[PDB]
Design an enzyme around this catalytic site. Structure first.
Site, PDB file in Angstrom:
ATOM      1  N   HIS A 163       0.857  -1.172   0.000  1.00  0.00           N
ATOM      2  CA  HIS A 163       0.000   0.000   0.000  1.00  0.00           C
ATOM      3  C   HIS A 163       0.897   1.227   0.000  1.00  0.00           C
ATOM      4  O   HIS A 163       0.650   2.176  -0.747  1.00  0.00           O
ATOM      5  CB  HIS A 163      -1.001  -0.030   1.171  1.00  0.00           C
ATOM      6  CG  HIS A 163      -2.167   0.896   0.997  1.00  0.00           C
ATOM      7  ND1 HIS A 163      -2.447   1.907   1.887  1.00  0.00           N
ATOM      8  CD2 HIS A 163      -3.099   0.993   0.037  1.00  0.00           C
ATOM      9  CE1 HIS A 163      -3.513   2.576   1.480  1.00  0.00           C
ATOM     10  NE2 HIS A 163      -3.908   2.080   0.322  1.00  0.00           N
ATOM     11  N   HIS A 188       1.891   4.356  -2.985  1.00  0.00           N
ATOM     12  CA  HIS A 188       1.688   5.786  -2.789  1.00  0.00           C
ATOM     13  C   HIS A 188       3.029   6.523  -3.015  1.00  0.00           C
ATOM     14  O   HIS A 188       3.048   7.731  -3.206  1.00  0.00           O
ATOM     15  CB  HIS A 188       0.869   6.027  -1.494  1.00  0.00           C
ATOM     16  CG  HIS A 188      -0.633   5.690  -1.450  1.00  0.00           C
ATOM     17  ND1 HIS A 188      -1.579   6.682  -1.277  1.00  0.00           N
ATOM     18  CD2 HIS A 188      -1.370   4.535  -1.490  1.00  0.00           C
ATOM     19  CE1 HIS A 188      -2.815   6.164  -1.264  1.00  0.00           C
ATOM     20  NE2 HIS A 188      -2.747   4.832  -1.379  1.00  0.00           N
ATOM     21  N   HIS A 229      -7.353  -0.693  -5.864  1.00  0.00           N
ATOM     22  CA  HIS A 229      -8.260  -0.795  -4.724  1.00  0.00           C
ATOM     23  C   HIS A 229      -9.311  -1.885  -5.007  1.00  0.00           C
ATOM     24  O   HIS A 229      -9.659  -2.682  -4.134  1.00  0.00           O
ATOM     25  CB  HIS A 229      -8.726   0.597  -4.234  1.00  0.00           C
ATOM     26  CG  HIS A 229      -7.734   1.449  -3.429  1.00  0.00           C
ATOM     27  ND1 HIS A 229      -7.191   2.533  -4.078  1.00  0.00           N
ATOM     28  CD2 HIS A 229      -7.174   1.495  -2.183  1.00  0.00           C
ATOM     29  CE1 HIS A 229      -6.362   3.206  -3.281  1.00  0.00           C
ATOM     30  NE2 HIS A 229      -6.272   2.594  -2.114  1.00  0.00           N
ATOM     31  N   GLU A 256     -10.182  10.044  -5.888  1.00  0.00           N
ATOM     32  CA  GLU A 256      -9.033  10.101  -5.009  1.00  0.00           C
ATOM     33  C   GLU A 256      -8.922  11.548  -4.587  1.00  0.00           C
ATOM     34  O   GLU A 256      -8.858  11.862  -3.397  1.00  0.00           O
ATOM     35  CB  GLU A 256      -7.715   9.708  -5.667  1.00  0.00           C
ATOM     36  CG  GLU A 256      -6.630   9.605  -4.609  1.00  0.00           C
ATOM     37  CD  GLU A 256      -5.209   9.471  -5.100  1.00  0.00           C
ATOM     38  OE1 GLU A 256      -5.044   9.311  -6.319  1.00  0.00           O
ATOM     39  OE2 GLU A 256      -4.288   9.527  -4.249  1.00  0.00           O
ATOM     40  N   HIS A 303     -12.024  10.500  -1.123  1.00  0.00           N
ATOM     41  CA  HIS A 303     -11.341   9.325  -0.618  1.00  0.00           C
ATOM     42  C   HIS A 303     -10.402   9.680   0.536  1.00  0.00           C
ATOM     43  O   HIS A 303     -10.404   9.023   1.578  1.00  0.00           O
ATOM     44  CB  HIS A 303     -10.611   8.674  -1.799  1.00  0.00           C
ATOM     45  CG  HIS A 303      -9.496   7.788  -1.392  1.00  0.00           C
ATOM     46  ND1 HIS A 303      -8.203   8.252  -1.275  1.00  0.00           N
ATOM     47  CD2 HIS A 303      -9.478   6.519  -1.027  1.00  0.00           C
ATOM     48  CE1 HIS A 303      -7.428   7.264  -0.859  1.00  0.00           C
ATOM     49  NE2 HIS A 303      -8.188   6.200  -0.678  1.00  0.00           N
TER      50      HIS A 303
HETATM   51 CU   LIG Z   1      -8.121   4.719   0.796  1.00  0.00          CU
HETATM   52 CU   LIG Z   2      -4.486   3.492  -1.171  1.00  0.00          CU
END
Ligand SMILES: [Cu+2]
Ligand SMILES: [Cu+2]
Ligand SMILES: [Cu+2]
Ligand SMILES: [Cu+2]
Lengths: 658, 658
Positions: free
Chosen positions: B206, B210, B235, B347, B362
């Site tokens: 995860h 990012h 996701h 997002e 999000h």
């Molecule tokens: Cu999230």
């Molecule tokens: Cu994420």
């Protein structure tokens, strides 16, 4: 002795194995005394530390008592003097340490146990033993702050210390300032009582009480004169002192918890990290609700109803005017012993005449309030601060829970016959006036301010390089002061009196003077002491640092034992000044005296003295309703009492400890 | 170069100042590069460290950029990529680190910056920089676990390590076992997915994601091809893999949060403590309320209404089939680009066409869900685990929140025309069979078990004595396997094809054969790669450890991808039935015009490659509704597809890694 001095080493660096250096010494631990982890590498590991020390301390391997019950609590768990299981576990360990034949067998036992028992538990049990054993009186125990700063200190400073101690050389390390007013912001009006709730001295006081008056343990350490009445009075004076602070912070008197089923508005997040549990303390959200409890490991299975039921049974006994023991006989709640019996019932000590019926109301309330976040242990979380004597007083809901309990006591109190003119009168004694003088300051003026005092924490910083670690604490303080009391004897003979000093706010939250029904509850004890009064006039001088209520400054910030911390003797007050009614009474020592024959008389140690030396109810003369026709302090008084208006000024300035 | 290697020494011991030893080297720091605290004792510091070391590094003092924005997050505060203020800070730092002309000048900036900036943010910002600069390419960055173990292991081990390192000399030290299934008891059914939710590999995933597809920062770093679509897909596959595990622990498919007013049923207490912040990630009680936020320091003032407005806006655009630009222009959500635009809107990356209108849905939901215990910051508490990319996947509510989001993307997906029979068949190409072979197991059988792996946490144990410190982690693992695929060509000409392999459960929660309307959302991508198909029969062998979905096992335990040991779902001890699907699509239509650095090289890295190598929608062919008259996977399949029953077996046993 050296033996006595060596037990104190057991306090130094709780989680560092006992074979590591303690001060200038090392313990020569027997092979079979090492824990499972270290025994297999034992000889290699013991030597590394064993070539550093000046001294060397031999420990004889002997046969020891069964430690399975004391060892049942995990090393990285938290310890709660409120949770029944843990009290049993502590009771057992105190039993063991108490029952060692002599100080050498105590040393040996403690050295075996220390690295096998939960450090907080060990520390509690040992301390209780050492205070009460015959061969270990004296023996200045270290403050639990120096031993476990993690129960006193914002978690943020531990890595600050760790860095300082690793990077900087010993001669050059600067003291760490401990954050204050750090547990909440201005949005919580409650933050304002940081100087009370989170004071090292206030919290140390709570711990000390629980060391001297433990609720479970050998009879030797439990049975103390009027310990149930003390439970009442000690918790009572906290409320009164706490309300006093609330009036100096533009707040109302603390509301009781009405109802165990309504949300609790005051959240609290302690910001403490237990290095021993290697886990932070849980907090409690604003408006949380108490939940039924089912925690198998703790052995608590308890519905909110069980608690409510105990409450109803106690109220019924107080209204009946008696309680019923397990044999079914009735014990009357008379005016000597009623408060005492009732104190035992509510705390639920072993001296409860009927635990089964009246319950364990006070302790179990603490557990309920501490576990609202994980009531059946599904999330494998420990209790919040309310679950620990050491830290309970930091949480605002403490004062609300205990305010509620105080109501049960008040309801017994208000059933007792008011003191008569005769009972409050000393004939021929009259107190014409009382004043206070500070140095430099106007007459009848008390001053408060901030002060920074240091505490060495090195003793509690496990696995940190050797070196002093000075931590700077910000705390309330008052300027020194004395009382000047004019008394006329007029009897033609010498008269012995008990001088009783209390102080209360003058007005209520609305600016209006207080009636006695209310004010009597707000009266905080400031002094009680014995005086011989000669025929004619007497001018009595009393320094604030002689208070029998307090303990010296050094007993909080570096064997004589605890009472209220001196820097908190006086409420904060206000910058503009806060009006208080100061009160005095001289009562007849001949009636107050306890036989206490011997083949002060007001300073009482529970460890030392067989009888509390004052035959009067604790909080005399404010513990009962006024006689008929009285409605306020100014018409409550007899000639042997006197009143004075006093101003409490606070200056928001700091001073460096003098 | 040597400068590359020195940059990596900045990840060593994050909170230890940079003048202390890093690795077997030391930096020679210009006096004025020291921080305020240490400039004065600079001389007594240079002597105290590094003379033990082999290399010494000269740092050229240079003129540096304005560093106050990065400095504005405090060194003992928490860092979150969901919080808009913190996202902006990281963007500025990233900017600085990417604006240095030399790799030499970057060393100087970082050296200066390190001891002055929040460690989490420094690791983040530098890491993104290094991954993107043209002169620091192909750098083996150290794993976040090794540098910041405090984001990854129960806080109970920290003192265990500190003891083991302090007491036992480095030759004799034993590994610390990292507890598993430590966050909750079997009283909570969610606890069964510890091996997924609290798996280090998955969390690292995860995090790494990012770092490669950051949503704020310099345009160069953010604008990647179809990153909005990746966000949806990444996701969507997490939910799919989660659901699979749920079906193997007698649970149901995860349920969306219904809305933002209903309490969140599932509480979660992570047992993590931040050594950088000396604060916890507070747990969330069961049945907690999402609350309006007024967090002033974080610069967040948002009502639950504001989020509901964003969600309603986005729903309105999806149904409309277009979004509206800041200038009022319409951009259509069509079959190719629609999912991508929508992912950037939801997002809310920089690339969102109208962030005023569609908001930051999000990220802000994450922040909302992480602040229920302290929404106005009156209790001075940081965010729960959901407020941190590093840690969010730990919490059950992560899947509930992302499922709620997925429903929005699905609402777009079902608007697109079903793929036609034409669009799916590859004329001439016909897949007759796929089987899986493992060693020592019957055909069409996958195998999972538990494994223990050691990791060196020494580079992450600030202020602990140097030397190896091994943590033993327990985690799922599968037995290696190969696909064997039979494809019949039928052209006289060579044909290129994308091999797309997915896997799903055979049956729903109730043991009933799943139907396409549900099954398609439960398809987990297992591999995608290009093949060349000779005329006539082709036999393709493809090993598990070749999957384009994964990254080597070496990169988790001592180029974004799923951790190799979580390729295969747990399955069951009695055997769990799945459907394995493969499609061979026509590469001549799937081909992407770009030609960059043998087409068969399918290892895609977002930073490396300018464009995504497959024109098909991510998730093809399962991303749309079935064409008329398809009800189940049996009726969906074209000739160039094939299906196989596969049995996934779990053995509850532990192997030491071979
Ligand atoms: Cu999230
Ligand atoms: Cu994420
Ligand atoms: Cu108490
Ligand atoms: Cu209490």
């Amino acid at each position: 002795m050296n033996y006595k001095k060596n037990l104190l080493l057991l306090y130094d660096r709780p989680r560092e194995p006992i074979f590591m250096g303690k001060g200038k010494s090392v313990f020569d631990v027997p092979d079979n005394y090492l824990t499972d982890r270290y025994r297999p590498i034992g000889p290699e590991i013991q030597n590394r530390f064993g070539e550093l020390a000046e001294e060397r301390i031999p420990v004889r391997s002997i046969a020891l008592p069964d430690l399975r019950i004391p060892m049942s609590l995990g090393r990285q768990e938290q310890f709660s003097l409120f949770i029944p299981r843990h009290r049993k576990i502590a009771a057992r360990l105190i039993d063991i340490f108490m029952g060692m034949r002599n100080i050498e067998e105590l040393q040996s036992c403690a050295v075996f146990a220390r690295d096998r028992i939960n450090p907080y538990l060990f520390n509690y049990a040992l301390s209780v033993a050492l205070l009460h054993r015959r061969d270990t009186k004296n023996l200045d125990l270290p403050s639990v702050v120096e031993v476990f700063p993690d129960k006193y200190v914002d978690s943020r400073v531990f890595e600050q210390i760790r860095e300082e101690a690793t990077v900087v050389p010993e001669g050059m390390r600067m003291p760490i300032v401990i954050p204050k007013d750090f547990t909440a912001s201005d949005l919580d009006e409650e933050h304002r009582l940081w100087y009370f709730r989170e004071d090292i001295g206030v919290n140390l006081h709570h711990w000390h009480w629980h060391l001297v008056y433990p609720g479970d343990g050998p009879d030797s350490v439990v049975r103390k004169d009027r310990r149930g009445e003390l439970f009442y009075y000690m918790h009572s004076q906290l409320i009164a002192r706490y309300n006093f602070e609330r009036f100096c912070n533009r707040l109302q008197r603390v509301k009781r918890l009405n109802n165990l089923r309504e949300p609790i508005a005051e959240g609290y997040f302690p910001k403490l990290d237990s290095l021993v549990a290697s886990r932070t303390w849980p907090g409690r959200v604003d408006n949380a609700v108490i939940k039924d409890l089912n925690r198998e490991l703790d052995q608590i299975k308890q519905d909110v109803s069980d608690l409510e039921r105990w409450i109803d049974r106690i109220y019924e006994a107080v209204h009946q005017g008696y309680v019923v023991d397990e044999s079914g006989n009735r014990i009357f709640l008379d005016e000597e012993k009623g408060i005492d019996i009732l104190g035992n019932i509510i705390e639920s000590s072993i001296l409860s005449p009927n635990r089964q019926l009246y319950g364990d109301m006070h302790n179990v309330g603490h557990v309920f309030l501490s576990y609202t976040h994980d009531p059946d242990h599904r999330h494998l979380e420990s209790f919040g601060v309310m679950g620990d004597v050491a830290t309970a007083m930091r949480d605002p809901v403490f004062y609300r829970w205990h305010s509620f309990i105080d109501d049960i006591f008040q309801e017994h109190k208000i059933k007792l016959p008011a003191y008569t003119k005769s009972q409050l009168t000393y004939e021929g004694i009259s107190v014409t006036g009382i004043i206070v003088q500070s140095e430099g300051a106007p007459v009848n003026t008390l001053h408060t301010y901030w002060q920074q005092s240091d505490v060495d924490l090195s003793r509690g910083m496990d696995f940190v390089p050797r070196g002093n670690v000075f931590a700077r604490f910000t705390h309330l303080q008052h300027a020194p002061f004395q009382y000047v009391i004019q008394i006329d004897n007029t009897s033609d003979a010498q008269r012995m009196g008990f001088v009783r000093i209390f102080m209360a706010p003058k007005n209520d939250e609305r600016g209006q003077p207080m009636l006695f029904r209310d004010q009597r509850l707000f009266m905080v004890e400031m002094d009680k002491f014995l005086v011989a009064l000669r025929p004619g006039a007497n001018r009595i001088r009393r320094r604030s640092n002689e208070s029998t209520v307090t303990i010296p400054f050094e007993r909080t910030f570096r064997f004589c034992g605890c009472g209220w911390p001196a820097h908190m003797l006086v409420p904060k007050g206000l910058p503009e000044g806060f009006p208080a009614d100061l009160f005095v009474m001289v009562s007849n020592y001949e009636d107050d005296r306890v036989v206490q024959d011997l083949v002060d008389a007001a300073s009482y140690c529970g460890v030392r003295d067989r009888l509390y030396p004052d035959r009067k109810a604790m909080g005399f003369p404010f513990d009962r309703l006024a006689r008929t026709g009285v409605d306020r302090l100014s018409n409550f008084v007899t000639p042997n009492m006197a009143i004075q208006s006093v101003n409490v000024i606070h200056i928001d300035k700091t001073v460096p400890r003098t």
